[PDB]
Amino acid sequence: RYNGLPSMEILGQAAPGKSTGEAMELMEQLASKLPTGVGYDWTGMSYQ
Amino acid sequence: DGTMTQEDISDYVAANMKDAISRTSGVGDVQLFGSQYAMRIWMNPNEL
């Protein structure tokens, strides 16, 4: 659970040459095309 | 669209929104103008 709601933590790296900014931007895009009632958020190293 | 009553709104605010708003930055206290849903067992003394 993350911030009181049921959650699932997903870890990964930006591909060689690409920055973490480019990687997260695509993860948000793919996250947007998921089923209804499924949101997302950034935690830990991605939060700061 | 009048698909939800006053109690249905009150429950949704209480169950999905109130907790997250109460943990939001600089929010001291949060009063719900309504009540969260509970399993109401409305007893009949005649049938009892």
Written as six digits, the tokens of A29 are 């895009």
This structure was determined by: X-ray
Task: Determine the Cα–Cα distance for residues A19 and A26; give it in Å rounded to an integer.
Answer: 12
> B23 CB near a chain A CB, below 8 Å?
yes
> A4 CB near a chain B CB, below 8 Å?
yes
Task: Determine the Cα–Cα distance for residues B48 and B45; give it in Å rounded to an integer.
Answer: 5
Burial of A2 from C-beta contacts in 10 A (0-12 / 13-18 / 19+): exposed
Resolution (angstroms) stands at 2.8
Opening angle at CA A33, ends A11 and B23, nearest 5: 60
Half-sphere exposure of B38 (CA within 13 A, CB side): 5
Q: Chain A: nearest CA to B12, how far in angstroms?
A: 14
Half-sphere exposure of A23 (CA within 13 A, CB side): 12
Helices (H) and strands (E) in chain B, counts: 2, 0
Q: Which of B2, B9, B1 is nearest to B37 (CA)?
A: B9
Contacts of A3 in chain B (CB under 8 A): 20, 23
Q: Which of A28, A5, A15, A9 is nearest to B16 (CA)?
A: A5
Contacts of B20 in chain A (CB under 8 A): 3-4
